[PDB]
Amino acid sequence: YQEVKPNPLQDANLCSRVFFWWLNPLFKIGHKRRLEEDDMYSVLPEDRSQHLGEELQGFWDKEVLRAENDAQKPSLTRAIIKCYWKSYLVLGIFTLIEESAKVIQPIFLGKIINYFENYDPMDSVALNTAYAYATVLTFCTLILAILHHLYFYHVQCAGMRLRVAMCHMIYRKALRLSNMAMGKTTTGQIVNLLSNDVNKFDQVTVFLHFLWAGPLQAIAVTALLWMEIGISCLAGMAVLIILLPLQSCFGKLFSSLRSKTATFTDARIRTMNEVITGIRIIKMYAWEKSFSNLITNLRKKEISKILRSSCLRGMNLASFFSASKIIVFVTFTTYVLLGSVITASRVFVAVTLYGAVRLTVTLFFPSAIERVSEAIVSIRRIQTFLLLDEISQRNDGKKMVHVQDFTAFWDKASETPTLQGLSFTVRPGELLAVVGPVGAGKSSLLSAVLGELAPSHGLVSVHGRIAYVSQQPWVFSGTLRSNILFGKKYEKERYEKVIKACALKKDLQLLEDGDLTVIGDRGTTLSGGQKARVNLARAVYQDADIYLLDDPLSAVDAEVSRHLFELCICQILHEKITILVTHQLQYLKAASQILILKDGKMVQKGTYTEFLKSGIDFGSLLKKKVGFQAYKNYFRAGAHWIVFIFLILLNTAAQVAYVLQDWWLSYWANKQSMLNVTVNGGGNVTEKLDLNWYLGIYSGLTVATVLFGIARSLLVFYVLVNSSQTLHNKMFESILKAPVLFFDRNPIGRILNRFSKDIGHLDDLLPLTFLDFIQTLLQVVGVVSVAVAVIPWIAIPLVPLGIIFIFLRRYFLETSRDVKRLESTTRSPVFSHLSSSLQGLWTIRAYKAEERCQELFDAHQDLHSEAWFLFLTTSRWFAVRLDAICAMFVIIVAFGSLILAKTLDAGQVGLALSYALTLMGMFQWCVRQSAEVENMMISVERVIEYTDLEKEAPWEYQKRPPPAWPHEGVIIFDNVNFMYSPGGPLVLKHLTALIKSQEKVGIVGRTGAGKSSLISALFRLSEPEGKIWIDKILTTEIGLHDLRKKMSIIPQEPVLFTGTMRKNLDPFNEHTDEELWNALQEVQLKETIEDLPGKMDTELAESGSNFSVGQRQLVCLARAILRKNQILIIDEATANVDPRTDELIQKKIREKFAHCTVLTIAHRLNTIIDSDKIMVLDSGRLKEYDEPYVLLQNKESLFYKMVQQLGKAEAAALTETAKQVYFKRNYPH
Ligand SMILES: CC1=C(CC(=O)O)c2cc(F)ccc2/C1=C\c1ccc([S@@](C)=O)cc1
């Protein structure tokens, strides 16, 4: 724990805490360089982990008394409520002064609105009394703008505290476990409910306080608007009592979808895994045509079901913007029809109020109804999880282990105990050998000695420290030295002695950094034997009194195991209590005592000498930023630019019809009080405005908004869902015809991440974010336009703010990237701290180390908590500097309009002031959407980068051979060379061979000599060098499928694909069922398939797991027989094959392929000596090419040495059958 740079919040006043002035050095540092983990600030030292964990644990433990004294029901929510209710109302007085300054504001606006109607003479007194009204209006909006971010931050800070308090108490509980219950459950859920049950706490507390502040406004504004003109206020409210349950009937219908189409988007990704894991095998089968139709058919229902909710979800965003002119149209058409007058002093006072009461329950109060059950469903689960059960508390100087009549049960449901009357006593210096069959109860006996097994009968006594090693090598994250120490002090001499006695010198010499290299989970880098070795070394390093070994020597070979035994067990622990368990009887001669277990009963206990005189046999008992190019490419991939121009025109004439909609309200108000009032003084006229002319125009103009909203929110979605439909087809038909070399570079994990993650982000998340930005940007351009097209004196003092705003954005959006990247880096150093501890906790509590289990977890919690405050206080710095340019524009539009009194007639005064009052609140939401768009735009690169992959050659080229090809198969190799990569190491070096008609020529060589490369060049897997001539026709002039369909191959690893056997044997349905049945009877697999009810349509599992390797080899042989090709190739098909089915396959290929040219490559020499000629390949070069018998006469040959290497009798039988077939072929008479 280093004294890093603390937070300056403690040395700051209230002004710098509100304005976030203490973030200047951090921004200055992040602007000039890159921020790292060593540049973060510390959290408040008041409650890091312990003051938040123990305070919550105390109340929960005290609640147990109030639950046991009555014994009715346990409650966990009560402990949470009685803990934070002490300070919850101190923050509830801030929601009463701030949320109430939005109702008095229209009251003050109306007092200035109705002032210009009496300024005929000089009335400075009336201006003197209005100066206060024009000052309170601009003074009230200051608190409403600069006193909201602090409250938001103070509310958001309460969530992370509860999250940390819940995450701290969930780990200390899993140290008093109930293993039988742990065995009943699965460890895949305890670590799982840690990334989803803590994120909801940071959101519910934000809108939870609006519950009692919501309906209050719906009464206050209701009364203030009923005190208006009259009872005509009910028609406008009648709409927003049915508009609320109207959007809830759409969600229920949407819930039927987006859950039904998951049987088409989760069925192709899994199938792609089967076809992409073996492209090396599927490429040379000419089966891409039979498999492309499967994915094409599946890609015929996803988009068709997506565009049945793409409209239902797009019509919802077109109503939220159009509902601002329906509540205003109805309330006036029922007020003008009753008979009254129209003045500008009773219009904007209610129009502005028509939004504050609207955006309170429509968007601000669904969350306090929907985000409550999600934050209460986890509480009724965590409580039950933490209240499962607990364990029973348990604890002459002579160190000894005494066991007398021990009898215990693993589970109470078992009728037969695993241990039946075990009685044995060991002493310091004796070696107790534990041997027995698999499952006799040795490991359970060691666990009982450790005390992990609950004793039902008998008593055990242990005196001293116990060092136990499990059968499965357990290891935690850390270096080798830290793993061996396990909290102990580092002693150079002792460490060297343990390393020498346990033989880690070769392992440290082979590894680069020695014992200082960090090891991940499970120790994947080191082999299991090395893990067992380092575990034994750590166990013996503890210098304990009792040692229990659970098979630590079986994970290595004989020599090293004897080494470790004779140098550690016989020498180091010759004075300690050792109870070792081994299955090898070679180490029982050095053991002082041998105890045998069988079915839980103690057979015999004694030394190795007593077992010898008894005549008992041990063997018998053991046998059973984004550039414009990407945007242009995404815009041009949807359709022609004409639809984009039409959409721009539609948007222009859907935005121009929104500002002009209120122009009629001003034209009607500036005509009623113009000359129609002069009836008593100023004139005498009884005429009035024509009701059948203004109302009709208003109705014809207000219908030009809903009709221009459905045809404006149903084209962008279609374009964006059609572009993704054509960008995927040009990315899938160019990944199956790729070279094999490309697949060997990228792994399977990095090649499957471009078809599941960034394949659906451009369908739902991209359009919903892109449409919400283009409809918000046109909404802010109409607010500055109405303030300049009225008073042409505001455009001059407007360029400094515009210049400041552009420089402020690219001063903040160049540093928040590092803050968000560092948080995600140290986001989860928890999951790999418990997943590797809950699987091997059987020894974490047998060392009395519970003290060093919480301090390590708290260290990883602080590292993550010190990175969340930095991100939470960062967003509150740009939002306090963006509200300072919006709280200045309102003052310069009021004071500049008040000085021009004798220029207007309150019309422009009302218009320009009713539009610049709602700017604060909508100018900050547009910036977050643009940032999200810019952040989600770097994701779409791989879908467009994989669209220009090179190809080798078309499947067919030209001038297919006449229907007489192929023939007997005279193969002529004329200086052919093969290379897996262009310019890489050459594999074949001038191979020249002549294969005659109907001859059996086989390939033999060591591993890596080039056996597979020969068949790879023969099947034209890669373009080879030279001239390879088959059937007197060059293979380069013939297409790939025309060559691959006329040749059959039996690979080394028989890979079978899922589906029916009909498609596996004949995917093109070119053969009849009778031929398939005849082939299956000839391969002798007809009886093994008749027992299944789906003989012709068995649903075969992945990779042929339902059948053995021999059955798969027979299936491939039947496939090659059904192919009826004149060229057969076998490469290591009989290496892992039992001798019976091996000789069966040999007889089958000798009977059916007698007139066919076969290429037999096998590792066993018994399946090659019966061939006509053999090819011994060495380092890619051929050495001898002749019959097997004439080669054996030369003792200096290589194949003779390989034959003699298998033994004397084997080589004798081999040369005997070789001479036999030689005399049979070359001398028939
Ligand atoms: C600050 C704020 C938040 C916090 C958040 O982002 O979670 C928010 C959350 C929502 F679900 C919806 C809206 C808002 C919002 C301000 C705001 C709301 C509406 C408008 S109107 C123009 O649609 C303008 C601004």
Author numbering: 5 to 399, 405 to 633, 695 to 1299
From the paper:
Sulindac, a non-steroidal anti-inflammatory drug (NSAID) that inhibits the prostaglandin pathway by blocking the activity of cyclooxygenases-1 and -226, also reportedly inhibits MRP4, as do many other MRP inhibitors, including salicylate, piroxicam, ibuprofen, naproxen, tolmetin, and etodolac. Finally, we resolved a cryo-EM structure of hMRP4 in complex with sulindac with an overall resolution of 3.77 Å, which showed excellent side-chain densities, allowing us to trace most regions of the complex and the bound sulindac. An EM density corresponding to sulindac was clearly defined inside a binding pocket formed by TM2, TM5, TM6, and TM12. Sulindac was in an extended conformation and trapped in the pocket formed by a large number of hydrophobic residues, including F156, F324, L363, L367, G991, M992, and W995. The methylsulfinyl-benzylidene ring moiety was anchored to the hydrophobic surface formed by F324, L363, G991, M992, and W995. The -SOCH3 functional group in the benzene ring was in contact with F324 and L363, and the benzene ring interacted with W995 through π-π stacking interactions. The fluoromethyl-indene ring was located in the pocket formed by H152, F156, and L367. As for PGE1, we also assessed the cryo-EM model of the sulindac-bound hMRP4 complex by all-atom MD simulations, which suggested that sulindac was stable in the binding pocket of hMRP4. Moreover, the two ligand-binding pockets are partially overlapped, suggesting that the inhibitor sulindac competes with PGE1 for part of the binding pocket although not with identical residues. However, sulindac may not be able to extrude by hMRP4 but keep binding in the substrate pocket due to its high binding affinity, resulting in the inhibition of hMRP4 (step 2b).
